């Protein structure tokens, strides 16, 4: 299956009962000007590149 | 005699030769002596008049409705009883009516009826205190009283009879196909017991 790439443009906060899940907003490389918010599992900064296995799943917040 | 509702005697005028012709109706509530009773396709909607069913509005209450046009009354002739008119089917010349039993029929619009309810209502809400008042009730109806219980008879006399105790011995529910001599008890019963709940019509 295809895989799409996106670029973190902001880090919103932290979630999970124990803080191991940061929340980010991203900008897709191809077809930019589409942004999605989703959760990540390890340390992360601005300008990082994330490989998204499925593009269209916007992620919920525990608070 | 033998009838709970009162009758009414109405005398019309023979339309083919000079005489008077008397007719026995069944009185509807509010019909008094000296009243004028109009019967036809163009009579008015007052209590006592004999109109076709297709000539009255929905919700009307009629009595002595004939089930085919010309039978001279069949459907509501006991005391306090009546019939309601639900709908009309002008294409088919048919009317929908609810009967005293809760059933619904489709009967011709040309069939007739009388407007009102049968007189003598409320009769069955006064107890017969005595066995002697049931004696005289059936003295002018027919031979159906007193009633002996089959389970008190001998086995030669009834399916229920016999035994060192008074008991049926088999299910009192009897198949519809049972032959004469077998049909005692409850015939073709869909259920049995104390009826709890809604009518389930």
């Amino acid at each position: 299956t295809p895989v799409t790439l996106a670029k973190v443009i902001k880090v919103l906060g932290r979630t999970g009962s124990r803080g191991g899940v940061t929340q980010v907003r991203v900008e897709f490389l191809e077809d930019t000007s589409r942004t999605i918010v989703r959760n990540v599992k390890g340390p992360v900064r601005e300008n990082d590149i994330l490989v998204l296995m499925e593009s269209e799943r916007e992620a919920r917040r525990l608070r | 005699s033998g009838r709970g509702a009162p009758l009414a005697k109405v005398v019309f005028r023979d339309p083919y030769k000079y005489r008077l012709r008397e007719e026995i109706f069944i009185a509807n509530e509010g019909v008094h002596t000296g009243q004028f009773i109009y019967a036809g396709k163009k009579a008015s909607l007052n209590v006592g008049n004999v109109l076709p069913l297709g000539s009255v509005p929905e919700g009307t209450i009629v009595s002595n409705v004939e089930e085919k046009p010309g039978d001279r009354g069949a459907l509501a002739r006991a005391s306090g009883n009546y019939v309601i008119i639900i709908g009309h089917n002008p294409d088919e010349n048919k009317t929908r009516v609810r009967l005293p039993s809760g059933a619904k029929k489709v009967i011709s619009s040309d069939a007739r009826g009388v407007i009102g309810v049968i007189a003598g209502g409320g009769r069955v809400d006064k107890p017969l205190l005595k066995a002697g008042r049931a004696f005289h009730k059936y003295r002018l109806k027919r031979n159906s009283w007193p009633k002996t219980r089959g389970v008190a008879m001998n086995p030669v006399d009834h399916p229920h009879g016999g035994g060192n105790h008074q008991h049926i011995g088999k299910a009192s529910t009897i198949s519809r196909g049972a032959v004469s001599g077998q049909k005692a008890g409850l015939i073709a019963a869909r259920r049995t017991g104390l009826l709890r709940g809604s009518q389930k019509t």
Binding site: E56, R57, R60 | -
Partner: protein, 127 residues
């Protein structure tokens, strides 16, 4: 130009229906629910299940020949919640991104005027 159907999203808790029909309502083009996309009972109403369900409706409507669909969004209603479930927005999003054009949108929950009695008793669900 455009061939129009009607899309009915019944976004309840415990499930989400996405099924399209002709403009008259009698004939159905496609019907698929969230439950037939997931294996566990608790996830039937999830946004993801609603998203997968809508992507199958779009696939089928394309080949039957419908190129646009109006929308009617519903909740259980009556004596029940009257608030859309978790997965209603996902289905509407998924139809839009599958290439199907979107016409009008309306909320068609049944509102009861004043009604028959509500479930639960006088003290409610004690939990």
């Amino acid at each position: 130009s455009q061939v129009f159907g009607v899309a009915r999203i019944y976004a309840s808790f415990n499930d989400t229906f996405v099924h399209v029909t002709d403009l008259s309502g009698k004939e159905t083009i496609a019907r698929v629910t969230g439950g037939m996309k997931v294996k566990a009972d608790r996830d039937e109403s999830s946004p993801y299940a609603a998203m997968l369900a809508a992507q199958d409706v779009a696939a089928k409507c394309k080949e039957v020949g419908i190129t646009a669909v109006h929308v009617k969004i519903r909740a259980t209603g009556g004596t029940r919640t009257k608030t859309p479930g978790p997965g209603g927005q996902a289905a509407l999003r998924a139809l839009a991104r599958s290439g199907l054009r979107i016409g009008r949108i309306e909320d068609v929950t049944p509102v009861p005027s004043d009604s028959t009695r509500k479930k639960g008793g006088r003290r409610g669900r004690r939990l």
